[PDB]
Amino acid sequence: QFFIEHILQILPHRYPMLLVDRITELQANQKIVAYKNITFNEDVFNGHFPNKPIFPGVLIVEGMAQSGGFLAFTSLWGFDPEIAKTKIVYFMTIDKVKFRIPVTPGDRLEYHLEVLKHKGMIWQVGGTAQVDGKVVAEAELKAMIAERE
Amino acid sequence: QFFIEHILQILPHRYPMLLVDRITELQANQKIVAYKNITFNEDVFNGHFPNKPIFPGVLIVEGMAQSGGFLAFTSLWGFDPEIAKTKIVYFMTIDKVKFRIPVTPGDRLEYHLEVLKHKGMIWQVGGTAQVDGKVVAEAELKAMIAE
Amino acid sequence: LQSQFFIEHILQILPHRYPMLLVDRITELQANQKIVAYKNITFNEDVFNGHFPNKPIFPGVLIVEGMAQSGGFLAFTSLWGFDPEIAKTKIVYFMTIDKVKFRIPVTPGDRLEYHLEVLKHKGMIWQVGGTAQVDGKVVAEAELKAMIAERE
Amino acid sequence: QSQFFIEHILQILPHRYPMLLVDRITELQANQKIVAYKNITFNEDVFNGHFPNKPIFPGVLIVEGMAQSGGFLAFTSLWGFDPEIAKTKIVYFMTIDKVKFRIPVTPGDRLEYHLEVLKHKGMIWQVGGTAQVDGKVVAEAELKAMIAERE
Amino acid sequence: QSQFFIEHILQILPHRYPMLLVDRITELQANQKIVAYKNITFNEDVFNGHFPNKPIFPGVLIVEGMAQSGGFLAFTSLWGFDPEIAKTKIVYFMTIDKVKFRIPVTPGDRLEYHLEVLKHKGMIWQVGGTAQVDGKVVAEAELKAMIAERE
Amino acid sequence: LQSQFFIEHILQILPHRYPMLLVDRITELQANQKIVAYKNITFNEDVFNGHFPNKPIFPGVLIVEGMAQSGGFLAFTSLWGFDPEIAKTKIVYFMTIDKVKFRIPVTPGDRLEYHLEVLKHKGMIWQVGGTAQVDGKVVAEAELKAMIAERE
Ligand SMILES: [Cl-]
Ligand SMILES: [Cl-]
Ligand SMILES: [Cl-]
Ligand SMILES: [Cl-]
Ligand SMILES: [Cl-]
Ligand SMILES: [Cl-]
Structure with a gap:
């Protein structure tokens, strides 16, 4: 389990x-389950x-992306802040x-992503977003990990 | 239950x-249980x-005052949006x-408040704030509803 | 229906x-065909x-959102024209996506220039596809299906 | 010193x-008292x-401002004016x-804060006092806060 | 009136x-002058x-506040405290x-704004003055505005 | 020193x-002579x-601020070229105005396009004047003097 400090x-x-x-x-290399609380604030x-407060659907996707990226990164390098800054x-x-x-x-807002396939630095994740056990959204995304600036 | 739409x-x-x-x-005129999600956003x-993100203790208290206010608006006038919009x-x-x-x-952040005393628009309540079943805070307060 | 609208109309x-x-x-x-709109990108x-x-980068998901909003404007006015009173009920x-x-x-x-075209539409159901462009160059592309719903 | 500006508070x-x-x-x-203030604007x-x-400065934020006043008094009373030490606290x-x-x-x-130390030991400070506007008292509060090294 | 609070300004x-x-x-x-102010806080x-x-209130915003004060002066001089008419202007x-x-x-x-009417001809108002903090002149400026119909 | 700089550079x-x-x-x-820069205006x-x-209107006083900042960029680069370590201290x-x-x-x-020319400059004191333009038309005019100083 990772908390906000680790994520940051x-x-x-x-x-x-x-x-x-x-x-x-x-x-x-397999899957991840993470969440984001939704508040009025x-x-x-x-x-x-x-x-009429509705959390943007595109942001639900951004949340799934971030979870997937966190998955792809930690699978390769584990919890490494120094390397994280270089990638x-x-x-x-999508x-x-x-x-x-x-x-x-x-x-x-709970994110459930699994690795569909990965080769080299190209990683494809997919899954759903859930609230109290029901699927509120779904999506597939493909990311490429590379060297920073 | 009362969702954000109602709360507003x-x-x-x-x-x-x-x-x-x-x-x-x-x-x-008895108690209320409500909650607020805490997110980095x-x-x-x-x-x-x-x-080092830490939800302000004073805001936890504000959240309990608000929970008690809801109980007060409703015990007083029931769920009447138009009487409320003027106060x-x-x-x-505290x-x-x-x-x-x-x-x-x-x-x-789950709020638990009970009414300790009340007269007219002046309300006194007290209780706790809880996270995953544990008490993270305790408090008592008195608020006033006004035109 | 005019073919040019400013922020006053969008609102x-x-x-x-x-x-x-x-x-x-x-x-x-x-x-019922297309719309070309844009959003200025500023550090502010x-x-x-x-x-x-x-390293300021405008979120890809927001690019998509801007594309969806452009399509939504097209869908609504394709049916009721510029009608604020009704627009406020849909x-x-x-x-x-x-x-x-x-x-x-x-x-x-x-x-950021949004280019959306109507791929299919029946009633309140609209399917749109297109691109987001900067200086004539495609920076992103997407397809989205939307529903013209009742606000209440 | 007895007077400090925003540069020093920060x-x-x-x-x-x-x-x-x-x-x-x-x-x-x-180790005794501190008088400070916060300007309240619509902006x-x-x-x-x-x-x-109806702009009303939240009551719980007045308490928060009194606590920060105490914190400044607490910190400088322990280590004097030392930024390098304070940056990780x-x-x-x-x-309350x-x-x-x-x-x-x-x-x-x-909004003028007036805090007095009622008791303090190590990192634990109990201050008490008022918040005043135009020489008049708008709030009273007693609070205990703790200074801690960030980890 | 002579003194107006945020409620009225709104x-x-x-x-x-x-x-x-x-x-x-x-x-x-x-038709003569106005003295008003805005508090400056870190928040x-x-x-x-x-x-x-290094928190420094922007100079262009001091002029803005001065302009806002001039505008209130001009408006109130023409119609007094009239919210209804205010919405149509x-x-x-x-x-500047x-x-x-x-x-x-x-x-x-x-930040205390000190403005006075320098000239008023038709729908054109010319105002000038200074911004002061604790009796000291912090800034000065002249401004000209046109009163018109809100659309 | 080039003639095209992006936000990462301005930063x-x-x-x-x-x-x-x-x-x-x-x-x-x-x-030491002139500079042309711009700021995109968006509802966001x-x-x-x-x-x-x-009724969104970009504040006129903020247009002068922008003209001043463009001038500031001119002043800094004229004085020390593109130097982030020295600029950081000012x-x-x-x-x-x-x-x-x-x-x-x-x-x-x-x-919003800013067009400024150096009217006078000596040391850290820079005086600039010019216009703010939108699609070739003069939107505003102004002259201002600014000083670069150590944050101390
Ligand atoms: Cl949505
Ligand atoms: Cl706290
Ligand atoms: Cl992105
Ligand atoms: Cl309050
Ligand atoms: Cl300034
Ligand atoms: Cl303006």
């Missing part, structure tokens, strides 16, 4: 684009939408995205 | 000071503290608060 | 608001504080 | 925007939600008692 | 967060980038001149 | 940060929340 040392993302609060499950809700995880494609249920404040 | 119709608090996401239990963490809430007193465990991103 | 049709209204101006609009946006420190919902591909990173100073 | 207190609620220190006696984010059409609230709000604080108010 | 000026830069009106003489977003580790500023900055403004400062 | 020269860095890219630069900027609701202070005229309101979707 692996991912370069910061406020307000770090969308993973905690990692509950992690199997190298988030700036996005001011505009999406007034008097970039670039998302090339496909098969489907939104079934709206995520709102109060929900625990 | 009763409490006048708005971003970034509305600190209750959902109401799980309510019993007029909240502006308060930029300054509290950099590299605001003022903090009167006492006997203790912080046991720090609340952080990933935590589900 | 009357779309429900999105700060910081999630990612379309600044509509330059071309063909009912909160998103860059966290994506990323010292909300465009996207059900799917496919074949998204990011080719070039978008950065402050860029003029 | 070097001592760990708090940062939008949670640094002390703008200036007008006087302080080591502050909390006002968007507290409350629309954090401050945890332990308890007998607080009472008497007058709403609004934009244009100069 | 009903007269269209400006909102984070561009409403006047917190209270302490003096107001129809303001602008200090995040102007400048990190705009105070378009055409020129002779502005000099003497002392930087920092968190903890009380 | 390494000017001390300004969000939400007060109002220059996104430099398109032209002549040491916090300042529009209050200036004004339902800040910029406004001294005077003059002859500012606001001819056309700037709104989301506009590309």
Whole structure:
């Protein structure tokens, strides 16, 4: 399990684009289960939408991407902050995205990603986003890990 | 239950000071149980503290005051959005608060409040704030509803 | 229906608001066919504080979002024309997103131009596909299916 | 020293925007008392939600400002003015008692903190005092906070 | 009235967060002058980038506050405290001149705007004055605005 | 010293940060003489929340700020070329603003182009004057004097 502090040392993302609060499950080269809490106290809700708070679907995808990248990175180098700073995880494609249920404040947005296939630095992950056991979204993504600036 | 939509119709608090996401239990003139999710994606963490996100203890208290306010608006006027939209809430007193465990991103901050006393618009309640079944804080407070 | 709309008009049709209204101006609009709009990218946006420190890159998912909002404007006005009163009773919902591909990173100073075309539409169901471009170059491409839903 | 400005507060207190609620220190006696203040203006984010059409500086933030006042007094009383030592320290609230709000604080108010040390041992400080506007008391509070090395 | 609080300023000026830069009106003489102020606190977003580790209220925002004060003066002089009519007008500023900055403004400062009508002909208002902190002239500037119909 | 600089470069020269860095890219630069730069204007900027609701207008005073920052970039690079270690120790202070005229309101979707020339300069004191332009038209005019000083 990894907490926000650990996440912050692996991912370069910061406020307000770090969308993973905690990692509950992690199997190298296999899968990951992480989540992000959804609360009203988030700036996005001011505009999406007034008097009707709905967590953006694209951000649910961004959350799945971040989880997948965290998976791809730790599988290769484990918990290594120094190496994390020397790498970039670039998302090339995203496909098969489907939104079934709206995520709102109060929900625990859980990400479930598994490694579909990986060769070299190219990693393809897929899975779902869930709230209390039900699939609220699904998607497949492909990332490329490379050397930073 | 009362979801955020409902909460917004009763409490006048708005971003970034509305600190209750959902109401799980309510019993007029008795008690209320609600909660707020804590995530890194909240502006308060930029300054509290950099590299060490800790949900402010005073905001935990504010969240309990708000939970008690909801119970007060409802015990008073039931769920009546139009009477509510004309009021605001003022903090009167806060006492006997203790912080046991720090609340952080990933935590589900559950509020437990019971009414200790009340007269007219002045309400006194007390209880705790809990994370995964454990008490992270205790407090008592008195607020006033006003036109 | 005109073919050019400014932020004043976008605000009357779309429900999105700060910081999630990612379309600044509509330059071309063909009912039931296509729309060409754009969003200016500037460092002065909160998103860059966290994506990323010292290296501002506009989130690929937001590029898609801007594409969806552009398509939503096209879908709505393709049916009711510029009608604020009705627009305020409808909300465009996207059900799917496919074949998204990011080719070039978008950065402050860029003029992110959205190019969406109507692949299929029946009733309130709209399927759109297209690209996001900067200086005539494709920076991303996507396909999305949306639903014109009732706000209440 | 007895007077300190925002430059000095920033070097001592760990708090940062939008949670640094002390703008200036007008006087302080080591291990004894500190007088400081925070300017309240409409141009502050909390006002968007507290409350629309009626800007009222949150009561719990006045308490927060008093605590930070105490923290500054605590830190300088232990290590004097030492930024390098202070940069890795954090401050945890332990308890809050007998607080009472008497007058709403609004934009244009100069919120003045008055804290006195009621007891302190090691990293644990118990301060007590008031928040004043135009020489009048708007709030009272007693609180215990702990200075801790960040780990 | 002679003194207007944030509540009143909100009903007269269209400006909102984070561009409403006047917190209270302490003096107001129809067609002659106005004295108002805005508190300066660290808890303001602008200090995040102007400048990190050195909070200095932007000079262009001091002029803005001065302009806002001039506008209130002009509007109230024509129709008094009338929120209803206020919503149908705009105070378009055409020129700014002779502005000099003497002392930087920092968190903890009380920025007091001192403006006076230099000329009023038809829908054109010319105002000038200074920004002061604790009796000291911090900035001066002249501004010209046009009263028009809100669209 | 080149004549085209991007945000990553501007970030390494000017001390300004969000939400007060109002220059996104430099398109032209002549040491000690002139500079042409620009800032993209988008609805997705916090300042529009209050200036004004339902009618986004980029504040005129912020246009002068942008002109000053472009000037600042000119001054720094003229003085020390592209030098991040030395620039990092400085800040910029406004001294005077003059002859500012606001001819056309700037709104989301506009590309605010700054055109400044060095009127006078000696040491850390720089005096510049020029215009702010949108699609070839003069949107604003201004003259200003600024000083570069150690953050001490
Ligand atoms: Cl959505
Ligand atoms: Cl705390
Ligand atoms: Cl991205
Ligand atoms: Cl309060
Ligand atoms: Cl300045
Ligand atoms: Cl303006």
